Amino acid sequence: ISSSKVGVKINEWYKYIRLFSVPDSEILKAEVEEEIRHMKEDHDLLLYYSLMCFRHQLMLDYLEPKTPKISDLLEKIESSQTDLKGILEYYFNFFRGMYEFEQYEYLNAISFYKQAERKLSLVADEIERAEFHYKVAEIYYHMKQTHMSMHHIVQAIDSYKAHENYTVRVIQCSFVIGLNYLDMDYPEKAIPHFKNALDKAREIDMSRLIGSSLYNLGLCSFAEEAYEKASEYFKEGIRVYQDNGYEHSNRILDILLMLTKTTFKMRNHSEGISWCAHGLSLSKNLNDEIMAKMFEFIHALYVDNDNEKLNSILNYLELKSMLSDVEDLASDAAKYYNEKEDHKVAVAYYEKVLYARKQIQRGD
Amino acid sequence: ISSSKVGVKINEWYKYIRLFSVPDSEILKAEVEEEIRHMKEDHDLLLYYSLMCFRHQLMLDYLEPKTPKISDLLEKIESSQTDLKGILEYYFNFFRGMYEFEQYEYLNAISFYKQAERKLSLVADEIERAEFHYKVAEIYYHMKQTHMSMHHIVQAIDSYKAHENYTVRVIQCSFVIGLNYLDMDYPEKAIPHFKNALDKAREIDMSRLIGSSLYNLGLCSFAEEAYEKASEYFKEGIRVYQDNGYEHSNRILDILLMLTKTTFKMRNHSEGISWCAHGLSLSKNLNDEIMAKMFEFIHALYVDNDNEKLNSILNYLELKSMLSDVEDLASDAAKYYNEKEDHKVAVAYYEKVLYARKQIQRGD
Amino acid sequence: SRGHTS
Amino acid sequence: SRGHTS
């Protein structure tokens, strides 16, 4: 029957996906699709194949953003979900959680991740467990669950650093670690990890990783209120993203948002509006409603003083389960209004900061 | 030599101390002191004896407050601290941490507790480990380290509930659990645990435990802004403390502080000053500088508007490593000034609340 | 103020 | 805004 022959090739396929080896991953994708052709109707093997195709696509889109094959692969994967068991059930929940995170579906992604976490003792490969620990630490950071994100990211970075050639994941883990130290107001303890990632990103010549390193470095200077140095980090990050075929990635909007916020705080009103312009039009073109709403908040704050639109956006982001952006944006409004000596409305946004922090603290 | 004969009696002595059995503890204290008389100069056995005398005194003072034998027992214990090993080294660090906590020496108590924590695998008795988990969860609550306090209090309450006659510790664990839920803004999830403790405290007729249950219940009503019901809980807690020989305990000042704060917020200015009066004079009589400073903050806020004395007191409490009281008191001033439409200075105290919460979040 | 942990 | 976890 040679059902294990397809089984071993799909596992090898997964190994090359984690190594970010597109040539090897494409070779084995073709090998599996030729073996699948002359094979009995094994529903678990076909579901295993469909899951790895979904994982293979997640790697490609990460390296080449969409100018949707993901949706068709998701439909076939969600056609047989009963009678699942063993490591295949782990792969199903874990991969679905990865997809939900890409769709800003945080509550669904957490739920999928926690189901995959229950079957972690079925994962003998330490590298595969490092993939899980990194991905669960990533979403915990975006939830500003710092202690849980640190608990998982240390387990991931140690397993990755034990092996070699997982350098891409090593850069990404350096992002998570430093960004956790940043959330704890330790920018001095975060710049080492980001400069570490920037160095190794320049070695493998990974343009978006270089830009993400510049973006995370600019977030440190922003925390230190080194707005000039922060804007320069943001500028070069937008430059490397655009100069290497990443100007259509949703993640460049994060850099545009901070650069708009930074130049506004530098009292460079004129330059700031043209930055908020480019960011909000690009958010509309990429159909990213969440990033567009964040640019609306910046425009309503520094340009319009439309506090009702500010409140509705903060309420929108809370229903989006993005309480950290609720805190960051309400903190932006509180400082600006307190600087403008409008202490009446500045109190109300300081209260919203306190509200978001308590909600973040509630956790589960 | 019968050195184990004294060793087994001191362990039995410890068992009766944890059970809060004063008659049994006094009997075995006398038995050990008679065996110690006819024994060779065993420095470890004498240090073991001196530690249990210190622990025996901590139990007595908890049941009968001082109208200082503790200081003499502490001097003899801190006369031989080198060449320590095994479970005796655990007892030394743990008991010193218990004493430092009673002296408001939180950083020293944490350090002692963490040294005792390193040797926890030497503790075979589950009940003895429950004593540690409760005591370490207690100080973590007072540090508003909610996740760590919850991590330890669950291990303690389960071991205690497994055995019987440790009901006093069961009430105290119900305090810690509910107070953690209160810090997470879950008063509905805290009243069950406090009513649980109040019931079992009334069974054993433990007056101060009944009052502490009323105090913790009043803190829930205060969180719900049920100031009338909160003041009634506080009133009865002061009544049971005074009517049963606890009017000279430092812990009655906590109840006086909240009742003063509550009646002030009820706009009952007149009744509130006479409450702050009784509390600040009693703090001076008990030589509790920390509780006296808290009554100074309430008087400077609602009566004097002395914001410079407020800032210095908050700075004093931060050096005292009491960031939770920094947050609670700065929150009291922010609401009062925002209600008085003094939004300029109300911002500054909301900022101090944000500062204290970030410091609490930093942890280690 | 901190609650009574007794 | 959240940093890039890539």
Author numbering:
A (entry chain A), B (entry chain A): 6 to 72, 78 to 374
C (entry chain B), D (entry chain B): 1 to 6
From the paper:
Proteins of the RRNPPA family are the most frequent pheromone receptors in Bacillota and use small secreted oligopeptides as pheromones. While most members of the RRNPPA family act as transcriptional factors through DNA binding, Rap receptors are specialized members that exhibit the capability to develop their function by interaction with specific protein targets. Binding of the pheromone produced from the propeptide, which is named Phr in this RRNPPA subfamily, induces Rap receptor inhibition. Our results reveal that distinct maturation processes generate multiple mature pheromones, which bind to receptors with varying affinities but produce identical structural and biological responses.
The first candidate corresponds to the canonical C-terminal peptide of 6 residues with the sequence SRGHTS and a second potential candidate would correspond to an internal pseudo-repetition of 6 residues, RRGHTA, separated by 14 amino acids. These 2 putative mature peptides only differ in the amino acids at their ends (positions 1 S/R and 6 S/A), maintaining the conserved RGHT central part of the pheromone. Interestingly, the internal pheromone RRGHTA showed the highest stabilization with a dTm of 75°C while the canonical C-terminal hexapeptide pheromone showed a much lower (63°C) dTM. Rap3T shows 4 times lower affinity (EC50 20,75 nM) for the putative Phr3T C-terminal canonical pheromone (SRGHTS) and more than 10 times lower affinity (EC50 69,75 nM) for the possible maturation variant of this peptide with one less amino acid. To molecularly assess the differences in affinity and stabilization for the alternative peptides analyzed we solved the structures for Rap3T in complex with RRGHTAS, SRGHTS, and RGHTS. Rap complexes with RRGHTA and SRGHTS peptides displayed C2221 space group and with cell dimensions that only allowed the presence of 1 monomer in the asymmetric unit generating the dimer by crystallographic symmetry. Remarkably, these structures exhibited nearly identical conformations as confirmed by the low differences in the superimposition of their Cα atoms for either individual monomers or the complete dimers (RMSD 0.36–0.50), dispelling the notion of peptides eliciting divergent conformational shifts. Comparison of complexes with RRGHTA and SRGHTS peptides showed that the sidechain of Arg in position 1 for RRGHTA mediates a network of salt-bridges with D264 and D335 plus hydrophobic interactions with M304 meanwhile the Ser in this position for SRGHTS only makes a hydrogen bound with Y225. These differences in interactions for position 1 may explain the lower stabilization seen in thermal shift assays and the higher EC50 value from thermophoresis assays for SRGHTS. In contrast, at the C-terminal end, the presence of a Ser in the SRGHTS peptide does not excessively broaden the interactions of Ala in the RRGHTA peptide.
